[PDB]
């Protein structure tokens, strides 16, 4: 009962005119409701979600970065059940991606939560987003390229989804860890990203794309020699005896700068030989009935209804109190239920 009442009152506000001030409040409540319910939250989805997505398109950008944070929160609790509304979500994301640190951060965090929600299903919605992803790496004004770091940290999570689109997405990753200008942190993330992707994709096509830049990075910058070796080592592990071509070529930089990794040395030697492995606050509003005019009794009522909402043991009413002060008909309508 309780979640259902609150959800109806909230959504009755959640329609333009009153929300001009009280968007944020409503969405904070909802997100707390679903967080509290478990997977029984799922029943409210078709009520919330159509309005919710339309709010994002309608509202001002003052709010909009917040709504996406909370959308991504809804996504996470609901998990795969969001699949029906995914088209609209991707349309929204696609509309409100721009080349500005402001929004990009949040949207990328949304993707992070979508991927983990849908899992195998995300593969379908990926290609609507690749055009934006490649546009991020290609050019980015972000201080220390941290936008692109977060997006790398997103791409780390795609797993087997990324299969059909690795040939798109692997080149611009490589162009980070080769280029001299690029600030060291971003560059590191790109190397560590290729390391993650190795554990859940195949790289046999892209032996030459990856290996030559690693080899280059080993020469130019001494700072990433450990990092790049730990990328290469895993790439070798995944390739297996397909690596036998490259051994000498790479060896000629490995001897040049005297570089030692257990992991690498082990695997090369292993390849060549061939064998891999609650009531005290309430009491003030109860009998404060020393009242005489209209205003005196109404103000008894107001304060009573709100005093109820604070207490009420159900989290799905507690939530509303915050709103119930700022908009009084929220307390009015939950009064009976609150009581």
């Amino acid at each position: 009962f309780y979640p259902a009442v609150s959800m109806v009152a909230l959504m009755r506000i959640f329609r333009d005119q009153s929300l001009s001030h009280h968007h944020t409040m409503v969405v904070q409540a909802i997100t707390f409701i679903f967080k509290s319910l478990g997977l029984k939250c799922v029943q409210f989805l078709p009520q919330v979600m159509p309005t919710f997505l339309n709010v994002i398109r309608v509202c001002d950008g003052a709010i909009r970065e917040f709504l996406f944070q909370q959308l991504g929160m809804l996504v996470s609790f609901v998990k795969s059940h969001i699949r029906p509304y995914m088209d609209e979500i991707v349309t929204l994301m696609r509309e409100f991606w721009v080349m500005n640190t402001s929004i990009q951060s949040t949207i990328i965090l949304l993707i992070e939560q979508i991927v983990v929600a849908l899992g195998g299903e995300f593969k379908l919605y990926l290609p609507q987003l690749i055009p934006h992803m490649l546009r991020v790496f290609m050019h980015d004004n972000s201080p220390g390229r941290i936008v692109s770091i977060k997006l790398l940290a997103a791409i780390q999570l795609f797993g087997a989804n990324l299969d059909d689109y690795l040939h798109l997405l692997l080149p611009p990753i490589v162009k980070l860890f080769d280029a001299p200008e690029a600030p060291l942190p971003s560059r590191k993330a790109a190397l560590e990203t290729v390391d993650r992707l190795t554990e859940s994709l195949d790289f046999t096509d892209y032996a030459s794309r990856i290996i030559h830049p690693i080899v280059r990075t080993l020469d130019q910058s001494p700072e990433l020699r450990s990092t790049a070796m730990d990328t290469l080592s895993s790439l070798v592990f995944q390739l297996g005896k397909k690596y036998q071509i490259f051994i000498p070529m790479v060896n000629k930089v490995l001897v040049r700068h005297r570089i030692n990794h257990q992991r690498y040395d082990v695997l090369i030697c292993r390849i060549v030989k061939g064998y891999t492995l609650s009531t005290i606050n309430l009491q003030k509003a109860w009998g404060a009935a020393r009242r005489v005019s209209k205003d005196d009794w109404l103000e008894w009522l107001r304060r009573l209804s709100l005093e109820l909402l604070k207490d009420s043991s159900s989290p799905s009413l507690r939530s509303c109190w915050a709103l119930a002060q700022a908009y009084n008909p929220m307390a009015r309508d939950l009064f009976n239920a609150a009581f």
Partner: protein, 166 residues
């Protein structure tokens, strides 16, 4: 018989409820449930004067959350909180103070800053020095604290009443 209202703001999952409930009740285990307006009460004396504290344990404000209007009308104190086991909490707490000063104008309002989870040495990333300098830069007090010691949190709520005394 004086009555003082105190707001504990901050980032979420830091230990606002942990401290607040430690002071008021005195138990190691606490409510591991994300709170929206968890009010409390407590009777304590500070230098002879009787103080009824009314403690507003607020829902933890994120990087973007528009600042409440309940707190710009009532309160004689703000215990702004971060946790020493993340940089996340520290960047957030700077912007809470940002928005709070944007909400009330800039008047000499009784603030302090609080570093919870000092007992966690091995997950610590913020130092005593940074927060001390940040507190000093605001013209505000500092403490480190621990919800594991009722002793420490007692010393916190005493500090804020002494700041509001001035």
């Amino acid at each position: 018989s004086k009555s003082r209202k105190i707001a504990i703001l901050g980032y979420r999952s830091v230990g606002k409820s942990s401290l607040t409930i430690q002071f008021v009740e005195g138990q190691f285990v606490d409510s591991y449930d994300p709170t929206i307006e968890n009010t409390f009460t407590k009777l304590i004396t500070v230098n002879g004067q009787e103080y009824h504290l009314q403690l507003v344990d607020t829902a933890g404000q994120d990087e973007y959350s528009i600042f409440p209007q309940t707190y710009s009308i009532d309160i004689n104190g703000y215990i702004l909180v971060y946790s020493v086991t993340s940089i996340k909490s520290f960047e957030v707490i700077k912007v809470i103070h940002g928005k709070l000063l944007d909400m009330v104008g800039k008047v000499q309002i009784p603030i302090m800053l609080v570093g919870n989870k000092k007992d966690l040495h091995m997950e610590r990333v913020i130092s005593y020095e940074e927060g001390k300098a940040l507190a000093e830069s605001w013209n505000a007090a500092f403490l480190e604290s621990s919800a594991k010691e009722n002793q420490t949190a007692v010393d916190v709520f005493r500090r804020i009443i002494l700041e509001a005394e001035k």
